[PDB]
Design a protein around this ligand. Structure first.
Ligand SMILES: COc1ccc(CC[C@@H](OC(=O)[C@@H]2CCCCN2C(=O)[C@@H](c2cccs2)C2CCCCC2)c2cccc(OCC(=O)O)c2)cc1OC
Length: 128
């Protein structure tokens, strides 16, 4: 399924080149532009553990998820991944624990040492 495909064909977008964050572009966005550190970013996502459990979708809160890019307001993989995205892009990310919740998890929903999968859509981004 979608997680396996990222394993097999995803691009390694980490600095350390440790396959900690793998990416496939599922829908090509607009232009060349990607967001800057500090930009307010608006996304819709669907996420799960890579084994399918704990599924969550921003769609269910009928409101985009909003954060400031590159400020540690989200897990490392999201700071790394969303920084590569164009407006309108949808990407798949497969994420090892080192770039997510590590040994502490985010209980009770996310366990220790969890690999995560997200489908992420970058709706828009704006400087504050
Ligand atoms: C482990 O490192 C970090 C961990 C957590 C954070 C905060 C968790 C952080 O979650 C995340 O980084 C990612 C990306 C954004 C979407 C939410 N999210 C998730 O993993 C969610 C997942 C869904 C399906 C599989 S994982 C997860 C859903 C369960 C609650 C934690 C968040 C978060 C930020 C802001 C708000 C929020 O919840 C709503 C609220 O609090 O009002 C949760 C920053 C971190 O790094 C600097």
């Amino acid at each position: 399924g979608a997680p396996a495909t990222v394993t097999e064909q995803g691009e390694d977008i980490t600095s350390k080149k440790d396959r900690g964050v793998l990416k496939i572009v599922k829908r090509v966005g607009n232009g060349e532009e990607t967001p800057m550190i500090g930009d307010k970013v608006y996304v819709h996502y669907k996420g799960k553990l890579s084994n399918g459990k704990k599924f969550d979708s921003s769609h269910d809160r009928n409101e985009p998820f909003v954060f400031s890019l590159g400020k540690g307001q989200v897990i490392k993989a999201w700071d790394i991944g969303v920084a590569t995205m164009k407006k309108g892009e949808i990407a798949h990310l497969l994420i090892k624990p080192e770039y997510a919740y590590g040994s502490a998890g985010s209980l009770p929903k996310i366990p220790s040492n969890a690999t995560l999968f997200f489908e992420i859509e970058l709706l828009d981004f704006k400087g504050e």
